[PDB]
Amino acid sequence: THCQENSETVALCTPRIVIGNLPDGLAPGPFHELRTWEIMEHMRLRPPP
Amino acid sequence: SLQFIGLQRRDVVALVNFLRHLTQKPDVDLEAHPKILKKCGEKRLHRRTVLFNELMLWLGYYRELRFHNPDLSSVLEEFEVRCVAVARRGYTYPFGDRGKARDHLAVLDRTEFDTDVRHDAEIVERALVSAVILAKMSVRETLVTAIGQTEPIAFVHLKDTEVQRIEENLEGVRRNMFCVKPLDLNLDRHANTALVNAVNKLVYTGRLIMNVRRSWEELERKCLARIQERCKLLVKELRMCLSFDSNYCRNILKHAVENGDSADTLLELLIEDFDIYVDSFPQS
Amino acid sequence: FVDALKTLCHPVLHEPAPCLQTFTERGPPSEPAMQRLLECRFQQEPMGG
Lengths: 49, 284, 49
Fold this sequence. Notes:
Chain A is of the alpha+beta class. Chain A has one helix spanning about 30-40; strands at about 1-5, 10.
């Protein structure tokens, strides 16, 4: 991002700590739902309690 | 007029003449005169009656403020004239970049007042920032460019002693906003261009208008807050005793106050049927 | 994906420093539309009160 610092514009870089922070248009919600289903099936919780 | 319980007539006449001579004293703020407040008699009377007295005093003070509200129209006309003069003089100046100069000339020449008493300050600020930008460009001193930021309003190349004198006059206006009379411009024809001189006069007039309006608005807001909180406290105090007169007083007090008209209605309603709720209040 | 680990876990992917450097060198956008995206302020403040 670009940001303001006492009348100057500066650049800022930060890590996306978790996979959820990816933009929706680039990793949408339905994809997260399907990935959660995948990991649940891997854990044998495919029909959950 | 104002009338309330529990006070000997000397204190009554004292405070009503205080209201009468309100406009002709410095520090027209009520809290600037604490002896008037304690005249209501805290620790002297019961909580109910002292709250009633303070509420009545604040209502009367608000009415006096709203009545004495200055007719700024005289100096608004001069401000418009000076905006026109600054624009006309700024057209002919040989600016290096005519584009942004023409933009600021346009915003200057568009300015006018719509007779809404609350809208004056922002119009003045817009005109003043454009004029100061033009003056700074004319003297070609540097000007702010950071995004989300605007040029501060200040005099350009004005003599320091005259600057502090103008600040003193503006402080005097801020102390008492009703007797304002500006005359102070000792500006001269020798130093500084004519455009700079016009901008300085315009910014003086505009800042005077801004200061008077802001002072009045702040004082009114404080008065409204005091009235509202007094009404809340008095209603809570009175609610514990269920009785016809107490219920009548509570129903009167339940009216919300957020405008001068609402304050007038509440004050007149308290005055008109004072007999009903006076029986409920204790004395001494 | 498990075969791709020869690349996916190499340090070069996780170093953002050259990307930040070129991002700074290019500078903030000059287009007027991009300006609305340029303005943001972040303040460090004491937590006492």
